[PDB]
Ligand binder design. Sequence first.
Ligand SMILES: *[C@@H]1O[C@H](CO)[C@@H](O[C@@H]2O[C@H](CO)[C@@H](O)[C@H](O)[C@H]2NC(C)=O)[C@H](O)[C@H]1NC(C)=O
Ligand SMILES: *[C@@H]1O[C@H](CO)[C@@H](O[C@@H]2O[C@H](CO)[C@@H](O)[C@H](O)[C@H]2NC(C)=O)[C@H](O)[C@H]1NC(C)=O
Ligand SMILES: *[C@@H]1O[C@H](CO)[C@@H](O[C@@H]2O[C@H](CO)[C@@H](O)[C@H](O)[C@H]2NC(C)=O)[C@H](O)[C@H]1NC(C)=O
Ligand SMILES: *[C@@H]1O[C@H](CO)[C@@H](O[C@@H]2O[C@H](CO)[C@@H](O)[C@H](O)[C@H]2NC(C)=O)[C@H](O)[C@H]1NC(C)=O
Ligand SMILES: *[C@@H]1O[C@H](CO)[C@@H](O)[C@H](O)[C@H]1NC(C)=O
Ligand SMILES: *[C@@H]1O[C@H](CO)[C@@H](O)[C@H](O)[C@H]1NC(C)=O
Ligand SMILES: *[C@@H]1O[C@H](CO)[C@@H](O)[C@H](O)[C@H]1NC(C)=O
Ligand SMILES: *[C@@H]1O[C@H](CO)[C@@H](O)[C@H](O)[C@H]1NC(C)=O
Ligand SMILES: *[C@@H]1O[C@H](CO)[C@@H](O)[C@H](O)[C@H]1NC(C)=O
Ligand SMILES: [Ca+2]
Ligand SMILES: [Ca+2]
Lengths: 55, 56, 221, 378, 378
Amino acid sequence: YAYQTNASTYEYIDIPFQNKYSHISMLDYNPKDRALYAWNNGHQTLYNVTLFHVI
Amino acid sequence: FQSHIIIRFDLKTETILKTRSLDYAGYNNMYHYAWGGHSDIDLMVDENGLWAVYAT
Amino acid sequence: NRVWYMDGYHNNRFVREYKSMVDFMNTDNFTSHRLPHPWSGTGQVVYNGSIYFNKFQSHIIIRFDLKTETILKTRSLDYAGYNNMYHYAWGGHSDIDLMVDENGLWAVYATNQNAGNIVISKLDPVSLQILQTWNTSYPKRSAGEAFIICGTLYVTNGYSGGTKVHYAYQTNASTYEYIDIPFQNKYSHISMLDYNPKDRALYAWNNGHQTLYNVTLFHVI
Amino acid sequence: AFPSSVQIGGLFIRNTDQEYTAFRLAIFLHNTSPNASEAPFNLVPHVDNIETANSFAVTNAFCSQYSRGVFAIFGLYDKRSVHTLTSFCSALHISLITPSFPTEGESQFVLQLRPSLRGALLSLLDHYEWNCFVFLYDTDRGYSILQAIMEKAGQNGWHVSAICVENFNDVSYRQLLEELDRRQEKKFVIDCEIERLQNILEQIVSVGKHVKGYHYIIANLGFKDISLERFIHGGANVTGFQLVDFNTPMVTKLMDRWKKLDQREYPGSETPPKYTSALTYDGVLVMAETFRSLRRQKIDISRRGNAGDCLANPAAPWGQGIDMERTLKQVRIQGLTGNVQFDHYGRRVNYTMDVFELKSTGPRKVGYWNDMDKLVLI
Amino acid sequence: AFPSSVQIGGLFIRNTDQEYTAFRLAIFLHNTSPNASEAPFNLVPHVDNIETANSFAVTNAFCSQYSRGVFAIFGLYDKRSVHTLTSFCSALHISLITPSFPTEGESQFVLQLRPSLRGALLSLLDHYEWNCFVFLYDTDRGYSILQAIMEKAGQNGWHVSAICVENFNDVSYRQLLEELDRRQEKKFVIDCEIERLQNILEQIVSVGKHVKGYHYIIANLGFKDISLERFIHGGANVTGFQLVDFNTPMVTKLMDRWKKLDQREYPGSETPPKYTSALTYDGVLVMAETFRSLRRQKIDISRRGNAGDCLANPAAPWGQGIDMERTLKQVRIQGLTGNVQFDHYGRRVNYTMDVFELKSTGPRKVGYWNDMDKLVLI
Ligand SMILES: *[C@@H]1O[C@H](CO)[C@@H](O[C@@H]2O[C@H](CO)[C@@H](O)[C@H](O)[C@H]2NC(C)=O)[C@H](O)[C@H]1NC(C)=O
Ligand SMILES: *[C@@H]1O[C@H](CO)[C@@H](O[C@@H]2O[C@H](CO)[C@@H](O)[C@H](O)[C@H]2NC(C)=O)[C@H](O)[C@H]1NC(C)=O
Ligand SMILES: *[C@@H]1O[C@H](CO)[C@@H](O[C@@H]2O[C@H](CO)[C@@H](O)[C@H](O)[C@H]2NC(C)=O)[C@H](O)[C@H]1NC(C)=O
Ligand SMILES: *[C@@H]1O[C@H](CO)[C@@H](O[C@@H]2O[C@H](CO)[C@@H](O)[C@H](O)[C@H]2NC(C)=O)[C@H](O)[C@H]1NC(C)=O
Ligand SMILES: *[C@@H]1O[C@H](CO)[C@@H](O)[C@H](O)[C@H]1NC(C)=O
Ligand SMILES: *[C@@H]1O[C@H](CO)[C@@H](O)[C@H](O)[C@H]1NC(C)=O
Ligand SMILES: *[C@@H]1O[C@H](CO)[C@@H](O)[C@H](O)[C@H]1NC(C)=O
Ligand SMILES: *[C@@H]1O[C@H](CO)[C@@H](O)[C@H](O)[C@H]1NC(C)=O
Ligand SMILES: *[C@@H]1O[C@H](CO)[C@@H](O)[C@H](O)[C@H]1NC(C)=O
Ligand SMILES: [Ca+2]
Ligand SMILES: [Ca+2]
């Protein structure tokens, strides 16, 4: 799911990622590093985002 | 714990400043995630500032 | 916002000066300016206060003023084909194509040393001197048309029927990539397709009709 | 004083993306060779990718390449453009290395890479003891197979029901299959184009003749490039031919290089190469070999002055074209399709093909056909 | 003093994107309605997509929705979750509107929208005079069809070869089909899930039993949603049932909005609605109708004091739940599946289905089956 608060719209996407250790409890986005900090079944993992801008 | 109260705590001076109440929010496994575990309120930040995701 | 109009590809030397888009879409009144030499093909450009064109059956680029009506620079493109040897797929003496982008003035031609492949060059807008050249791997005789958005050359595959953007060359990284971006050829035969950065739009000539495309660009962060 | 860069021409037609990819890959591998003896020169391809080969764009492309000073032209043709290209190449002493369908009377500076499917089909027909069958054919590759089949039927008293399916649609295919099933005709030989063959197989499966009791002989040079999974499940007899051996060190090396290629820079690399791309690669290797051999004989090939108008009043041919033709016809190399060797007519000789039969596990090699040994079974 | 917002519950199953889309579309159409009589309140759905972990997850979702103060729950179930959900709904006096497979044992606070398929199947098997056939079934929807078939075979002397294909793979499917064809069995009745039925049909086409002479009866409520293309060309006899009539003004009125929906905002709208989605839409309409009827009865619905834990030591049923169930069993509406009306057991009564047959042009309406009129042909 995706919600744009600026336009107050919603869109069903299907971007996939990988639950390597089969359980996710925390998943947050950190601006400065542009990365997703995640807690995977008692382990600390990071994901990298891919943001695109259309003109 | 067991309340819809957002608390700001200093990690440098080790004191309390603000303890506010999230208006119309569930607590104690009322509106948790799919995995549960008392995740009714999720606090995050982004390039615009501080945001809270909950349910009403 | 004055548009510039040219008909023919062999011996015409008259350009039109419709002063406005409303004076071009409906009004059939125009000012006819003569050229010292006729052009070849549909590859010319109007940049700043002048027009860059090709001089008859030669590999010569001429800068002509559209206000003072004189010649300041007339140079020769180095190792560039002329007189229907490295044309597009539609022919018509389109051996040299001139375009502009946010970085400046570019010329797409072909070289005998580089087989018959498309070669890009950056030209000085004043002195018409070669600044830097880039080698691509797409033959010009099978291209049909090409256009530059900003430092990237997009090359079509055909001129009538199923037309699509087939080739892309990034001169900043000097890398090539085959893409599939269809665009609709409504009126069969196409002759000219150029890019305008101010309107960010593709101006095209489709079987005697003047057509506009609005492009979509994306940037990855 | 051999030139450091020899110029060759290339003429490609519609639906030739993978063959052009193989041509470009072979050009890459020849030019950037670490060996200093494999590439004593460079290959400069002047490429024309036309859409409609209608003997007029073909003539324009040939004249444009001839004006550029090319030595040999790697060209593809169809039934509407073979004669013009062959006549233009023979008149001006310009060699034409073609991977398209072989024709008869195509000597004088034409070298065909595709082996003939005439002897193998007859050697499979008489071994299977077929005397009453159907022949679904098209005329997009000539009339040699049909003429040979009719001659064999006349000389052996066979009953061949020859049907042309050039203008047959899907429901017409279904009606034809039902009509042939009414007359208890369960033995078929299909000699059509790849898309037409796939449509015929799809119609056969849809109407329900892919079961035991039906036999199909596929007249094609590639048997592993056609999907026959439902034919495997049904159990019908399917027999075909293969030209490129996938268990060959050269072919496996090509496959290793091919699976490491980018699809965005080398289109058509998402699938294993067909026999046409293999013939293109062998043709580029043959051109490199004959250019190296011309360098060995100290022949300075140079088309200076001869380049000009193709349709001149005095027909002026290339003075060194006959040497190029002789050196091209005297090659004998080993490559993707096995042994590449040509006779004095420009046709491939001692070529070996593998006959495959469809079984429950899948395709299964049952023997090989050789030009001098006929059919040999295992 | 009826509340302006009425809370309903929604429990959804794995692979339920399209039915949830239909539920959301019906909620949209009810909430934002120009008529003030069609929407005197606002439906508030509490939705849980659980990806069921059986009765544990079902009980957790039911307790979570029950604590929120829902009046009725629109939930789905499977063979591993029907009993616990029905018992929880009946014990706590919470109505359960389910478009899932019909059952018999549950008789309190359960409203099933899917009509039974035993009567139409028996009428078709006795009008076709079938006496020896093969019944391929699965136990993902109960044992009612198998029990009815065995009872009819015992009372009529039929020869039914009953095979459970729950743990069958494609290879085993092909072996079973070949074995059944060896025993000269050409009459089949298939009662399986949609994916299992599609796999069975694909295997049938693979072995080649889609030719004329083979008869298949599909025990499914949707016949036009099955990809039957090769069976048309082969000529096999296919007979099926359809619940929703696409030539109905209400159905085409919905289809006008369905083709105008956005895929990225309403996922699953890229395909025509199945019978499950139509039953979901009819169930939402039934909930709206019974809430309006409760409004007309001057019954102040509320769950202020009953909101709490499900597993309390004293059972605390909802006082007004019996009023909701009585009003729910008395509805008679017109919707996508036709006449929606229920008996005192909460089962479908007075419903009409269309029996279709596969011809050379496509599915042809042959007859219609009604609950009291049995099978009537045209
Ligand atoms: C487009 O043309 C204008 C004038 O026609 C150029 O302006 C000149 O700018 C240079 C330095 O910026 C001055 O020395 C000249 O005197 C200007 N010209 C005139 C007539 O005053 C402008 O630079 C041109 N644009 C580009 C990108 O070169
Ligand atoms: C564009 O390609 C041509 C041909 O491949 C290049 O010309 C060759 O340049 C190399 C130097 O890198 C010389 O060693 C060769 O002798 C040149 N070939 C001929 C036939 O003259 C040309 O340099 C390339 N241009 C650029 C900018 O890379
Ligand atoms: C048939 O073609 C084959 C090509 O493989 C020829 O076999 C080679 O013949 C040469 C002699 O001319 C030997 O040096 C090679 O070792 C042979 N290759 C092998 C055995 O793999 C064969 O000579 C040709 N036959 C005729 C009659 O021309
Ligand atoms: C079965 O459904 C039909 C409607 O399809 C019912 O016919 C309706 O009966 C009521 C009386 O109860 C009339 O007011 C309607 O006008 C009838 N509708 C028609 C004829 O289209 C029929 O009564 C139902 N039968 C049962 C036993 O419930
Ligand atoms: C397309 O571009 C032209 C250029 O002026 C202009 O009409 C407008 O920006 C666009 N028109 C559209 C998006 O309809
Ligand atoms: C390099 O060339 C020499 C002579 O042409 C040959 O003997 C050798 O096998 C070649 N090696 C490779 C790796 O191609
Ligand atoms: C199919 O091939 C087998 C041998 O593999 C042969 O025995 C059989 O007769 C063939 N069937 C037909 C119909 O030709
Ligand atoms: C809306 O529909 C209801 C039910 O048919 C009807 O009673 C009411 O009059 C309608 N309102 C309008 C404004 O048409
Ligand atoms: C097939 O269906 C048609 C139409 O119902 C019927 O007449 C025919 O007897 C059937 N054939 C078989 C073999 O069931
Ligand atoms: Ca989070
Ligand atoms: Ca252009």
